[model samples]
Target: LFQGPSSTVTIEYFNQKKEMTKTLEEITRDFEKENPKIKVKVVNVPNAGEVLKTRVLAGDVPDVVNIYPQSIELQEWAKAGVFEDLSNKDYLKRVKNGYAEKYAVNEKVYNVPFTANAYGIYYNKDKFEELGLKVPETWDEFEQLVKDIVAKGQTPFGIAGADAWTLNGYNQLAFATATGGGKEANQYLRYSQPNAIKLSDPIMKDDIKVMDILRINGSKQKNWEGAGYTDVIGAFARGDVLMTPNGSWAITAINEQKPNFKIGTFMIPGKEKGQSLTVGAGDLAWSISATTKHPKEANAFVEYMTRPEVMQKYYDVDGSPTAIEGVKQAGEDSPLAGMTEYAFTDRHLVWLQQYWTSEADFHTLTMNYVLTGDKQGMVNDLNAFFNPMKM
Candidate 1:
């Protein structure tokens, strides 16, 4: 075996300040130990968009980019031919094919997904048992469960409005999944084809209806102001809250600190019969620089990272779930075992992260206004924002 140059790979993304960054460092150490010549350098940048763009323009781009699936930069970079097509690669083939489906643009493969994240209900099993509440599978039952919890003077749901965008991922996923809106919701929102959707359309109204409920009652900040998603997790851990909808990424966060908590994770509860209960995919994914000096090394990392066992470690440590075939919960002792089992069922929606670029921000705006109790404003804002002329 041959060792390449002792080069450091720089990665930039938001939420890097989260303790999981340290776990990434641990993963990097393990990787470097396995192949001592390669050095991994993670740069925690504040504005994720500006950092990636500035670096690329300055010719200071990273060999590997761990970007959120919802990033608009992906579409911009794809237009600029800044990514390589990873389809037809053997390791990628080993990856379950639909893995790249959401992030594909112009019939080219631009991203290799590390995780397929869906928002789900996170609850304390012991508390659920004590309260005699079962995980509600239908929307009405779900609402009743929340009402009961709140009637008992407990927080029914955790709303992390500090970032504004956090509420968008959780609320919309639950609403859409409950309504059995998967690609239809994406299409209705015009997330895939911006030009094809009209703001006043009826189906769009349904999506807004979902937003309205959350705005009026569910996890909006007005319902629970000044809260961060982490706070929601903390509150739930301390038994202050009953449930919260979040992606798979939080699995690592919980286990790292509050190791004894028994978190019960399940699909977003349904409101209608036969609706998909999944939400968006979570975690950083590997993107290759189109201008990489060492395309081979970049491709090698893509292949190396997506390998079932390797990606298993990434998900195992980070709480991100992989759609990669043969990927299951890392083990029985894993705190995220329940979450991973739900992920394997393939019943969750992966909405926000896929589709045309930067839609996440638009969706985030909807979330923020809803948290502020402005559903009508969200509809107006989204209509204007997604308008092709304005976008």
Candidate 2:
């Protein structure tokens, strides 16, 4: 048996509040047992993007690391000699073709997706039934549905622009609803260097068109100030909003925090029925520092966390799904049913969040303004904002 070290190995990860750290610790224990020689210690950090960039500059970094918002940076880090190339036959078997083709830049992988955060239209199923409404498949139908709700004095969608990323959620929906440009954006960004994207492209225009509608809908939300996603959850719970384009992670929060609501999700509506759904592997992956004193030990820790048995502990208690396959959702009491279905099913497929380019920051800015009834301004803003930032 490949035993883990009896000595300790420290790692670092980030989340909004270190919520996932406890679950990771639980999973690591299983790795410890199988490889008792390895002791894994996890350090909690915030602003994963800044930490990773700063550390790469300062020459201090963790052997094992977890971060979102660093997807592009991580891939580049592999090239910059900040992280090691990690592709292998066994690893590819788990991540599948799309992951390898899209994320494993230059035929070398520096990261592995661990938890996906797929976003789609989450609806109140009971309310939809009561209204005898079919879930929307296209932007026209979705807007019409919103109009119908507003006519009856109910809000159609709820959104919060309080946090910057909230604007990004709308950007995804916008791109999907536009011309066949979502695929183009993914392709454009993948081969290009990380953070080296221009926002003045079709991707920006696509989001502006959709954001115009959301602005009208969101204007009705409490205060003209954009609401954060949590407020949207409350809106749905109180029956103020009928729909949301939200990450699947909201499932646990809705069920545990607002048991009175019934929720379900569908693909982000397109411009017409049966259009392309933008989906990708949306997990925050972990990578070991290329400059680390230990490489074999770090990989050992990763393999341990990825085993099916240990992965189960994370899903069972934390209400988050694991990247490891063949691990069924902890049956019936599953906290992530919608996400699992989305991943497996073909009908509502879309690009995962990590597949998006760092031009995503520009997406956030454009969507926020567009939602406030400034589509032209959004396009202009993107052009102006990106022209100077262009790499």
Candidate 3:
């Protein structure tokens, strides 16, 4: 359906953090400017999953849609035949395989990864040096670091427990470290084996314990549960705490609050030294709708968005690592640069919750443990929660 005075393609994206709205708008403007024959429409949908679900049910899906590869909803939509698989598409070859592999289901690719995100502890470099603290490599050293910070009258870890998703990062990191490397760790995060998800697994149990350790010792603020994610970033910016668990996006927020804040990132430490793993993956990717009437226009839009210049603009605004090869990070001096080491060492882990069908429930239960520190209760709750899910 040609709209306005020219043919147009509409791309519907979920603005998870409101970071991509302006970037997408600019990209759309440029695409239309260069290709006068095809106009571009960018639709930002909040709570996109619900909207996509409704659209899928109504048979009125958008031509192009944003997707998170690890998301259970992607699996649902793909299985429902709502996505146009881009397995052999030219655009698919442009993206990095490490990220593209994340979106594949049974050897079929459905989306093009545009950006990568890493999660870990964000620490004040000034504070670390002032206190003579070294980045801890092992879980015990991390605990000791917290204790050391406490003895020096500083908060070692500042977490935004008010948000359930913030608390789940520890679980994801622990699973990665405890389960070992590569797809096996990812499989554990995905709960790959049927009827095999028990938090009672020693590694999983230790994961809870690691979270509890931070809950009791690393927590710098007494009322962290009341702080939102942004509030913690602001606190960290203000030097109220020495460290906080966060992702690559937090630096952007921290910089907004304190323009010259000196921060560093390190993967969440595992049980043993050198066992640390960085949990990350394609944060945002785009997929075409199987029912799109404007496949030509839609594919054109994807090509425009995937261009080195356009993708760099998106990454500059989004402040995450680029998923496309040959495109370097916009901020070379960013503390997140340490992520390069993890990537080089192949110590990366998938976000995990993306693959879990019951992520919200699991997040809530994990939050309960965050507040209560009931390890056994958390384990029992996890077992009960996963028992019903066949996969």
Best by TM-score: 3
lDDT for model 3 comes to 0.73
In order of listing, the candidates' clash counts read 8, 18, 1
What do the candidate models score in CA lDDT, each in turn? 0.61, 0.60, 0.73
Q: Candidate 1 at residue 308, lDDT?
A: 68
How close to the true structure is residue 275 of candidate 3, measured as C-alpha lDDT? 79
Span of 10 residues, lowest total lDDT, candidate 1: 9-18
Tens digit of per-residue lDDT, candidate 3, span 82-168: 888788888777786556866677678887877767888888888888889998888888878888888888887667778777756
Candidates arranged by lDDT, highest first:
3, 1, 2
lDDT of 3 at 140: 83
- The alpha-carbon RMSD values of the candidates against the true structure, listed in the order shown, are 5.2, 5.3, 3.5
Residue-by-residue lDDT tens digits, candidate 2, 238-348: 767777666666775666556465666776666767663634444546776777766777877766656667666765666554456756664432433543454533433
Select the stronger candidate by TM-score from 2 and 3: 3
Candidate 3: TM-score?
Answer: 0.87
Local error of candidate 2 at residue 384 (angstroms): 1.6
* Alpha-carbon shift of residue 208 in model 1 (angstroms): 6.6
lDDT of 1 at 303: 72
